[PDB]
PDB file of all heavy atoms in Angstrom:
ATOM      1  N   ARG A  38      89.884  63.211  72.387  1.00  0.00           N
ATOM      2  CA  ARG A  38      88.919  62.231  71.897  1.00  0.00           C
ATOM      3  C   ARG A  38      87.502  62.725  72.091  1.00  0.00           C
ATOM      4  O   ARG A  38      86.675  62.572  71.214  1.00  0.00           O
ATOM      5  CB  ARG A  38      89.144  60.904  72.602  1.00  0.00           C
ATOM      6  CG  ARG A  38      90.073  59.979  71.853  1.00  0.00           C
ATOM      7  CD  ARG A  38      89.851  60.112  70.361  1.00  0.00           C
ATOM      8  NE  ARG A  38      90.392  58.940  69.666  1.00  0.00           N
ATOM      9  CZ  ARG A  38      89.862  57.751  69.708  1.00  0.00           C
ATOM     10  NH1 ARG A  38      88.769  57.496  70.406  1.00  0.00           N
ATOM     11  NH2 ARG A  38      90.417  56.761  69.039  1.00  0.00           N
ATOM     12  N   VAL A  39      87.217  63.329  73.252  1.00  0.00           N
ATOM     13  CA  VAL A  39      85.882  63.863  73.493  1.00  0.00           C
ATOM     14  C   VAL A  39      85.584  65.012  72.539  1.00  0.00           C
ATOM     15  O   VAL A  39      84.465  65.138  72.000  1.00  0.00           O
ATOM     16  CB  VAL A  39      85.703  64.282  74.962  1.00  0.00           C
ATOM     17  CG1 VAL A  39      84.450  65.067  75.152  1.00  0.00           C
ATOM     18  CG2 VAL A  39      85.718  63.047  75.838  1.00  0.00           C
ATOM     19  N   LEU A  40      86.563  65.885  72.311  1.00  0.00           N
ATOM     20  CA  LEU A  40      86.396  67.023  71.370  1.00  0.00           C
ATOM     21  C   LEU A  40      86.164  66.511  69.952  1.00  0.00           C
ATOM     22  O   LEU A  40      85.293  67.030  69.262  1.00  0.00           O
ATOM     23  CB  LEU A  40      87.617  67.917  71.437  1.00  0.00           C
ATOM     24  CG  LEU A  40      87.839  68.646  72.759  1.00  0.00           C
ATOM     25  CD1 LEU A  40      89.191  69.309  72.763  1.00  0.00           C
ATOM     26  CD2 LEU A  40      86.714  69.655  72.916  1.00  0.00           C
ATOM     27  N   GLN A  41      86.892  65.493  69.547  1.00  0.00           N
ATOM     28  CA  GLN A  41      86.696  64.935  68.194  1.00  0.00           C
ATOM     29  C   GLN A  41      85.350  64.230  68.100  1.00  0.00           C
ATOM     30  O   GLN A  41      84.719  64.268  67.041  1.00  0.00           O
ATOM     31  CB  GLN A  41      87.804  63.980  67.876  1.00  0.00           C
ATOM     32  CG  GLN A  41      87.486  62.973  66.799  1.00  0.00           C
ATOM     33  CD  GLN A  41      88.718  62.256  66.289  1.00  0.00           C
ATOM     34  OE1 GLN A  41      89.079  61.190  66.756  1.00  0.00           O
ATOM     35  NE2 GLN A  41      89.396  62.852  65.335  1.00  0.00           N
ATOM     36  N   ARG A  42      84.924  63.597  69.192  1.00  0.00           N
ATOM     37  CA  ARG A  42      83.607  62.939  69.163  1.00  0.00           C
ATOM     38  C   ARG A  42      82.487  63.960  69.015  1.00  0.00           C
ATOM     39  O   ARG A  42      81.479  63.694  68.359  1.00  0.00           O
ATOM     40  CB  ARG A  42      83.430  62.150  70.465  1.00  0.00           C
ATOM     41  CG  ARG A  42      82.604  60.877  70.301  1.00  0.00           C
ATOM     42  CD  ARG A  42      82.949  59.886  71.430  1.00  0.00           C
ATOM     43  NE  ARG A  42      82.760  60.472  72.743  1.00  0.00           N
ATOM     44  CZ  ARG A  42      83.693  60.492  73.682  1.00  0.00           C
ATOM     45  NH1 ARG A  42      84.896  59.977  73.454  1.00  0.00           N
ATOM     46  NH2 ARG A  42      83.421  61.007  74.879  1.00  0.00           N
ATOM     47  N   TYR A  43      82.641  65.106  69.646  1.00  0.00           N
ATOM     48  CA  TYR A  43      81.655  66.161  69.479  1.00  0.00           C
ATOM     49  C   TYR A  43      81.945  67.053  68.278  1.00  0.00           C
ATOM     50  O   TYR A  43      81.174  67.999  68.031  1.00  0.00           O
ATOM     51  CB  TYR A  43      81.560  66.995  70.750  1.00  0.00           C
ATOM     52  CG  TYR A  43      80.816  66.263  71.828  1.00  0.00           C
ATOM     53  CD1 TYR A  43      81.468  65.331  72.646  1.00  0.00           C
ATOM     54  CD2 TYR A  43      79.458  66.452  71.999  1.00  0.00           C
ATOM     55  CE1 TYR A  43      80.786  64.662  73.615  1.00  0.00           C
ATOM     56  CE2 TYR A  43      78.770  65.764  72.977  1.00  0.00           C
ATOM     57  CZ  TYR A  43      79.421  64.876  73.784  1.00  0.00           C
ATOM     58  OH  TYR A  43      78.763  64.174  74.752  1.00  0.00           O
ATOM     59  N   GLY A  44      83.003  66.795  67.534  1.00  0.00           N
ATOM     60  CA  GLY A  44      83.242  67.443  66.278  1.00  0.00           C
ATOM     61  C   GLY A  44      84.064  68.702  66.335  1.00  0.00           C
ATOM     62  O   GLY A  44      84.411  69.239  65.285  1.00  0.00           O
ATOM     63  N   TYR A  45      84.376  69.202  67.525  1.00  0.00           N
ATOM     64  CA  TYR A  45      85.146  70.449  67.618  1.00  0.00           C
ATOM     65  C   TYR A  45      86.575  70.267  67.090  1.00  0.00           C
ATOM     66  O   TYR A  45      87.168  71.227  66.592  1.00  0.00           O
ATOM     67  CB  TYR A  45      85.173  70.912  69.071  1.00  0.00           C
ATOM     68  CG  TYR A  45      83.855  71.411  69.567  1.00  0.00           C
ATOM     69  CD1 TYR A  45      83.093  70.669  70.421  1.00  0.00           C
ATOM     70  CD2 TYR A  45      83.366  72.650  69.149  1.00  0.00           C
ATOM     71  CE1 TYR A  45      81.864  71.112  70.877  1.00  0.00           C
ATOM     72  CE2 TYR A  45      82.153  73.113  69.617  1.00  0.00           C
ATOM     73  CZ  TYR A  45      81.399  72.368  70.468  1.00  0.00           C
ATOM     74  OH  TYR A  45      80.208  72.804  70.910  1.00  0.00           O
ATOM     75  N   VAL A  46      87.113  69.038  67.200  1.00  0.00           N
ATOM     76  CA  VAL A  46      88.496  68.785  66.792  1.00  0.00           C
ATOM     77  C   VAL A  46      88.459  67.669  65.741  1.00  0.00           C
ATOM     78  O   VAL A  46      87.717  66.679  65.912  1.00  0.00           O
ATOM     79  CB  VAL A  46      89.390  68.412  67.979  1.00  0.00           C
ATOM     80  CG1 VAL A  46      90.246  67.199  67.663  1.00  0.00           C
ATOM     81  CG2 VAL A  46      90.239  69.574  68.382  1.00  0.00           C
ATOM     82  N   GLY A  47      89.248  67.807  64.695  1.00  0.00           N
ATOM     83  CA  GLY A  47      89.285  66.842  63.627  1.00  0.00           C
ATOM     84  C   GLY A  47      90.120  65.620  63.940  1.00  0.00           C
ATOM     85  O   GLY A  47      90.034  65.078  65.029  1.00  0.00           O
ATOM     86  N   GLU A  48      90.908  65.188  62.963  1.00  0.00           N
ATOM     87  CA  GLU A  48      91.737  63.993  63.105  1.00  0.00           C
ATOM     88  C   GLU A  48      92.857  64.234  64.096  1.00  0.00           C
ATOM     89  O   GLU A  48      93.371  65.369  64.214  1.00  0.00           O
ATOM     90  CB  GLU A  48      92.316  63.513  61.793  1.00  0.00           C
ATOM     91  CG  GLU A  48      91.394  63.382  60.518  1.00  0.00           C
ATOM     92  CD  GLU A  48      90.839  64.705  59.950  1.00  0.00           C
ATOM     93  OE1 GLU A  48      90.937  65.726  60.660  1.00  0.00           O
ATOM     94  OE2 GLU A  48      90.323  64.706  58.812  1.00  0.00           O
ATOM     95  N   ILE A  49      93.290  63.178  64.798  1.00  0.00           N
ATOM     96  CA  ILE A  49      94.288  63.263  65.836  1.00  0.00           C
ATOM     97  C   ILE A  49      95.368  62.219  65.537  1.00  0.00           C
ATOM     98  O   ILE A  49      95.156  61.034  65.689  1.00  0.00           O
ATOM     99  CB  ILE A  49      93.693  63.031  67.231  1.00  0.00           C
ATOM    100  CG1 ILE A  49      92.528  64.036  67.483  1.00  0.00           C
ATOM    101  CG2 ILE A  49      94.754  63.161  68.289  1.00  0.00           C
ATOM    102  CD1 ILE A  49      91.576  63.551  68.538  1.00  0.00           C
ATOM    103  N   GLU A  50      96.525  62.706  65.122  1.00  0.00           N
ATOM    104  CA  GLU A  50      97.642  61.818  64.746  1.00  0.00           C
ATOM    105  C   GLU A  50      98.678  61.797  65.858  1.00  0.00           C
ATOM    106  O   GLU A  50      99.048  62.873  66.368  1.00  0.00           O
ATOM    107  CB  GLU A  50      98.260  62.234  63.420  1.00  0.00           C
ATOM    108  CG  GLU A  50      98.092  63.705  63.085  1.00  0.00           C
ATOM    109  CD  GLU A  50      98.489  64.017  61.649  1.00  0.00           C
ATOM    110  OE1 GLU A  50      98.136  63.230  60.748  1.00  0.00           O
ATOM    111  OE2 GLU A  50      99.151  65.065  61.457  1.00  0.00           O
ATOM    112  N   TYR A  51      99.124  60.619  66.249  1.00  0.00           N
ATOM    113  CA  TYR A  51     100.188  60.498  67.236  1.00  0.00           C
ATOM    114  C   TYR A  51     101.532  60.488  66.556  1.00  0.00           C
ATOM    115  O   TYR A  51     101.725  59.928  65.453  1.00  0.00           O
ATOM    116  CB  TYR A  51     100.007  59.209  68.014  1.00  0.00           C
ATOM    117  CG  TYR A  51     101.030  58.981  69.132  1.00  0.00           C
ATOM    118  CD1 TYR A  51     101.101  59.847  70.194  1.00  0.00           C
ATOM    119  CD2 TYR A  51     101.921  57.911  69.078  1.00  0.00           C
ATOM    120  CE1 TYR A  51     102.031  59.647  71.208  1.00  0.00           C
ATOM    121  CE2 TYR A  51     102.837  57.713  70.079  1.00  0.00           C
ATOM    122  CZ  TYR A  51     102.897  58.594  71.134  1.00  0.00           C
ATOM    123  OH  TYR A  51     103.797  58.402  72.131  1.00  0.00           O
ATOM    124  N   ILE A  52     102.492  61.117  67.211  1.00  0.00           N
ATOM    125  CA  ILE A  52     103.894  61.133  66.722  1.00  0.00           C
ATOM    126  C   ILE A  52     104.783  60.643  67.837  1.00  0.00           C
ATOM    127  O   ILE A  52     104.704  61.105  68.967  1.00  0.00           O
ATOM    128  CB  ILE A  52     104.300  62.561  66.291  1.00  0.00           C
ATOM    129  CG1 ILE A  52     103.385  63.066  65.188  1.00  0.00           C
ATOM    130  CG2 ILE A  52     105.739  62.552  65.840  1.00  0.00           C
ATOM    131  CD1 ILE A  52     103.371  62.147  63.983  1.00  0.00           C
ATOM    132  N   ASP A  53     105.645  59.675  67.492  1.00  0.00           N
ATOM    133  CA  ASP A  53     106.500  59.028  68.489  1.00  0.00           C
ATOM    134  C   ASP A  53     107.904  59.660  68.360  1.00  0.00           C
ATOM    135  O   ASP A  53     108.817  59.084  67.811  1.00  0.00           O
ATOM    136  CB  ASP A  53     106.542  57.522  68.237  1.00  0.00           C
ATOM    137  CG  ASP A  53     107.415  56.742  69.254  1.00  0.00           C
ATOM    138  OD1 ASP A  53     108.144  57.313  70.088  1.00  0.00           O
ATOM    139  OD2 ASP A  53     107.313  55.483  69.241  1.00  0.00           O
ATOM    140  N   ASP A  54     108.007  60.872  68.883  1.00  0.00           N
ATOM    141  CA  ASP A  54     109.309  61.394  69.237  1.00  0.00           C
ATOM    142  C   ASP A  54     109.696  60.806  70.583  1.00  0.00           C
ATOM    143  O   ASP A  54     108.839  60.349  71.340  1.00  0.00           O
ATOM    144  CB  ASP A  54     109.303  62.925  69.322  1.00  0.00           C
ATOM    145  CG  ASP A  54     108.397  63.419  70.414  1.00  0.00           C
ATOM    146  OD1 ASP A  54     107.388  62.751  70.720  1.00  0.00           O
ATOM    147  OD2 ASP A  54     108.655  64.518  70.974  1.00  0.00           O
ATOM    148  N   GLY A  55     110.996  60.793  70.874  1.00  0.00           N
ATOM    149  CA  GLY A  55     111.484  60.128  72.045  1.00  0.00           C
ATOM    150  C   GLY A  55     110.997  60.754  73.365  1.00  0.00           C
ATOM    151  O   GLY A  55     111.032  60.099  74.407  1.00  0.00           O
ATOM    152  N   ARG A  56     110.632  62.011  73.299  1.00  0.00           N
ATOM    153  CA  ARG A  56     110.335  62.797  74.491  1.00  0.00           C
ATOM    154  C   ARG A  56     108.826  62.818  74.769  1.00  0.00           C
ATOM    155  O   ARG A  56     108.187  63.841  74.824  1.00  0.00           O
ATOM    156  CB  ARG A  56     110.863  64.203  74.351  1.00  0.00           C
ATOM    157  CG  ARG A  56     112.388  64.259  74.137  1.00  0.00           C
ATOM    158  CD  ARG A  56     112.769  64.186  72.656  1.00  0.00           C
ATOM    159  NE  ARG A  56     114.144  63.686  72.503  1.00  0.00           N
ATOM    160  CZ  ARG A  56     114.677  63.397  71.358  1.00  0.00           C
ATOM    161  NH1 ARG A  56     114.014  63.506  70.187  1.00  0.00           N
ATOM    162  NH2 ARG A  56     115.957  62.980  71.289  1.00  0.00           N
ATOM    163  N   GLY A  57     108.265  61.609  74.942  1.00  0.00           N
ATOM    164  CA  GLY A  57     106.927  61.465  75.480  1.00  0.00           C
ATOM    165  C   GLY A  57     105.814  61.398  74.464  1.00  0.00           C
ATOM    166  O   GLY A  57     104.694  60.966  74.799  1.00  0.00           O
ATOM    167  N   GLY A  58     106.056  61.808  73.223  1.00  0.00           N
ATOM    168  CA  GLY A  58     105.017  61.797  72.208  1.00  0.00           C
ATOM    169  C   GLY A  58     104.444  63.143  71.906  1.00  0.00           C
ATOM    170  O   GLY A  58     104.521  64.084  72.715  1.00  0.00           O
ATOM    171  N   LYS A  59     103.847  63.260  70.720  1.00  0.00           N
ATOM    172  CA  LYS A  59     103.209  64.495  70.295  1.00  0.00           C
ATOM    173  C   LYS A  59     101.856  64.177  69.651  1.00  0.00           C
ATOM    174  O   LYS A  59     101.620  63.088  69.149  1.00  0.00           O
ATOM    175  CB  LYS A  59     104.057  65.249  69.267  1.00  0.00           C
ATOM    176  CG  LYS A  59     105.395  65.623  69.797  1.00  0.00           C
ATOM    177  CD  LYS A  59     106.219  66.356  68.765  1.00  0.00           C
ATOM    178  CE  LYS A  59     107.485  66.815  69.375  1.00  0.00           C
ATOM    179  NZ  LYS A  59     108.532  67.133  68.349  1.00  0.00           N
ATOM    180  N   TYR A  60     100.949  65.157  69.671  1.00  0.00           N
ATOM    181  CA  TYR A  60      99.648  64.995  69.039  1.00  0.00           C
ATOM    182  C   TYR A  60      99.453  66.109  68.019  1.00  0.00           C
ATOM    183  O   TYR A  60      99.507  67.307  68.341  1.00  0.00           O
ATOM    184  CB  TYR A  60      98.515  65.048  70.093  1.00  0.00           C
ATOM    185  CG  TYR A  60      98.457  63.805  70.922  1.00  0.00           C
ATOM    186  CD1 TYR A  60      98.535  63.888  72.317  1.00  0.00           C
ATOM    187  CD2 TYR A  60      98.297  62.537  70.351  1.00  0.00           C
ATOM    188  CE1 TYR A  60      98.447  62.775  73.078  1.00  0.00           C
ATOM    189  CE2 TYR A  60      98.231  61.426  71.133  1.00  0.00           C
ATOM    190  CZ  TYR A  60      98.305  61.533  72.494  1.00  0.00           C
ATOM    191  OH  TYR A  60      98.228  60.399  73.263  1.00  0.00           O
ATOM    192  N   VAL A  61      99.178  65.718  66.772  1.00  0.00           N
ATOM    193  CA  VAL A  61      98.872  66.695  65.729  1.00  0.00           C
ATOM    194  C   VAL A  61      97.379  66.630  65.513  1.00  0.00           C
ATOM    195  O   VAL A  61      96.822  65.584  65.160  1.00  0.00           O
ATOM    196  CB  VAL A  61      99.657  66.362  64.408  1.00  0.00           C
ATOM    197  CG1 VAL A  61      99.364  67.437  63.387  1.00  0.00           C
ATOM    198  CG2 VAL A  61     101.126  66.242  64.721  1.00  0.00           C
ATOM    199  N   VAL A  62      96.706  67.771  65.749  1.00  0.00           N
ATOM    200  CA  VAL A  62      95.244  67.828  65.754  1.00  0.00           C
ATOM    201  C   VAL A  62      94.807  68.732  64.624  1.00  0.00           C
ATOM    202  O   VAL A  62      95.328  69.819  64.436  1.00  0.00           O
ATOM    203  CB  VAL A  62      94.701  68.365  67.105  1.00  0.00           C
ATOM    204  CG1 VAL A  62      93.247  68.583  67.041  1.00  0.00           C
ATOM    205  CG2 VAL A  62      95.072  67.404  68.212  1.00  0.00           C
ATOM    206  N   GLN A  63      93.831  68.233  63.841  1.00  0.00           N
ATOM    207  CA  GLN A  63      93.264  69.000  62.769  1.00  0.00           C
ATOM    208  C   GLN A  63      92.078  69.841  63.314  1.00  0.00           C
ATOM    209  O   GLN A  63      91.269  69.338  64.069  1.00  0.00           O
ATOM    210  CB  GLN A  63      92.759  68.093  61.646  1.00  0.00           C
ATOM    211  CG  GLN A  63      93.883  67.352  60.931  1.00  0.00           C
ATOM    212  CD  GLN A  63      94.586  68.251  59.954  1.00  0.00           C
ATOM    213  OE1 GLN A  63      94.512  69.460  60.007  1.00  0.00           O
ATOM    214  NE2 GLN A  63      95.353  67.623  59.042  1.00  0.00           N
ATOM    215  N   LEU A  64      92.031  71.096  62.883  1.00  0.00           N
ATOM    216  CA  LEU A  64      91.008  72.044  63.317  1.00  0.00           C
ATOM    217  C   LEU A  64      89.988  72.257  62.214  1.00  0.00           C
ATOM    218  O   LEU A  64      90.322  72.406  61.058  1.00  0.00           O
ATOM    219  CB  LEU A  64      91.639  73.354  63.747  1.00  0.00           C
ATOM    220  CG  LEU A  64      92.939  73.240  64.547  1.00  0.00           C
ATOM    221  CD1 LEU A  64      93.714  74.527  64.500  1.00  0.00           C
ATOM    222  CD2 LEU A  64      92.630  72.873  65.982  1.00  0.00           C
ATOM    223  N   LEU A  65      88.720  72.299  62.614  1.00  0.00           N
ATOM    224  CA  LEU A  65      87.612  72.325  61.656  1.00  0.00           C
ATOM    225  C   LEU A  65      86.855  73.630  61.651  1.00  0.00           C
ATOM    226  O   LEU A  65      85.764  73.724  61.137  1.00  0.00           O
ATOM    227  CB  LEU A  65      86.614  71.176  61.967  1.00  0.00           C
ATOM    228  CG  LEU A  65      87.271  69.851  62.345  1.00  0.00           C
ATOM    229  CD1 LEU A  65      86.293  68.877  62.935  1.00  0.00           C
ATOM    230  CD2 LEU A  65      87.994  69.248  61.165  1.00  0.00           C
ATOM    231  N   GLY A  66      87.427  74.690  62.244  1.00  0.00           N
ATOM    232  CA  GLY A  66      86.741  75.966  62.288  1.00  0.00           C
ATOM    233  C   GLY A  66      85.543  75.983  63.185  1.00  0.00           C
ATOM    234  O   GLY A  66      84.635  76.825  63.011  1.00  0.00           O
ATOM    235  N   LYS A  67      85.453  75.049  64.114  1.00  0.00           N
ATOM    236  CA  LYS A  67      84.260  74.855  64.919  1.00  0.00           C
ATOM    237  C   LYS A  67      84.334  75.459  66.321  1.00  0.00           C
ATOM    238  O   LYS A  67      83.315  75.599  66.960  1.00  0.00           O
ATOM    239  CB  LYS A  67      83.950  73.348  65.064  1.00  0.00           C
ATOM    240  CG  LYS A  67      83.832  72.579  63.754  1.00  0.00           C
ATOM    241  CD  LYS A  67      82.736  73.120  62.779  1.00  0.00           C
ATOM    242  CE  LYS A  67      81.556  73.760  63.501  1.00  0.00           C
ATOM    243  NZ  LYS A  67      80.244  73.455  62.856  1.00  0.00           N
ATOM    244  N   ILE A  68      85.528  75.821  66.757  1.00  0.00           N
ATOM    245  CA  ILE A  68      85.701  76.332  68.110  1.00  0.00           C
ATOM    246  C   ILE A  68      85.448  77.840  68.092  1.00  0.00           C
ATOM    247  O   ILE A  68      86.027  78.562  67.272  1.00  0.00           O
ATOM    248  CB  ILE A  68      87.095  76.032  68.641  1.00  0.00           C
ATOM    249  CG1 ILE A  68      87.279  74.512  68.764  1.00  0.00           C
ATOM    250  CG2 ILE A  68      87.331  76.687  69.982  1.00  0.00           C
ATOM    251  CD1 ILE A  68      88.662  74.113  69.135  1.00  0.00           C
ATOM    252  N   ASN A  69      84.598  78.311  69.004  1.00  0.00           N
ATOM    253  CA  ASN A  69      84.450  79.709  69.262  1.00  0.00           C
ATOM    254  C   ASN A  69      85.221  80.178  70.497  1.00  0.00           C
ATOM    255  O   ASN A  69      85.643  81.334  70.569  1.00  0.00           O
ATOM    256  CB  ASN A  69      82.957  80.087  69.433  1.00  0.00           C
ATOM    257  CG  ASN A  69      82.128  79.674  68.246  1.00  0.00           C
ATOM    258  OD1 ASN A  69      82.138  80.296  67.219  1.00  0.00           O
ATOM    259  ND2 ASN A  69      81.423  78.547  68.377  1.00  0.00           N
ATOM    260  N   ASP A  70      85.395  79.273  71.469  1.00  0.00           N
ATOM    261  CA  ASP A  70      86.225  79.545  72.602  1.00  0.00           C
ATOM    262  C   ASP A  70      86.487  78.228  73.317  1.00  0.00           C
ATOM    263  O   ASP A  70      85.583  77.428  73.507  1.00  0.00           O
ATOM    264  CB  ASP A  70      85.567  80.532  73.556  1.00  0.00           C
ATOM    265  CG  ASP A  70      86.500  81.027  74.634  1.00  0.00           C
ATOM    266  OD1 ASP A  70      87.752  81.063  74.398  1.00  0.00           O
ATOM    267  OD2 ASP A  70      86.038  81.358  75.749  1.00  0.00           O
ATOM    268  N   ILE A  71      87.739  78.036  73.742  1.00  0.00           N
ATOM    269  CA  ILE A  71      88.140  76.815  74.438  1.00  0.00           C
ATOM    270  C   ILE A  71      89.025  77.222  75.623  1.00  0.00           C
ATOM    271  O   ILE A  71      89.625  78.302  75.633  1.00  0.00           O
ATOM    272  CB  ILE A  71      88.861  75.798  73.515  1.00  0.00           C
ATOM    273  CG1 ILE A  71      88.906  74.428  74.126  1.00  0.00           C
ATOM    274  CG2 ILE A  71      90.267  76.299  73.218  1.00  0.00           C
ATOM    275  CD1 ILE A  71      89.235  73.344  73.160  1.00  0.00           C
TER     276      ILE A  71
END
Side-chain angles (χ1 to χ4, degrees):
Chain A
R38 269 321 200 71
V39 169
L40 294 170
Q41 158 167 94
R42 213 157 55 234
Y43 284 84
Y45 291 105
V46 135
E48 313 65 347
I49 305 159
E50 25 191 43
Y51 182 64
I52 300 303
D53 181 352
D54 63 330
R56 301 89 203 173
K59 301 180 175 161
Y60 288 123
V61 185
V62 173
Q63 295 281 18
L64 317 161
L65 320 167
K67 305 301 331 218
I68 296 172
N69 305 282
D70 190 29
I71 197 164

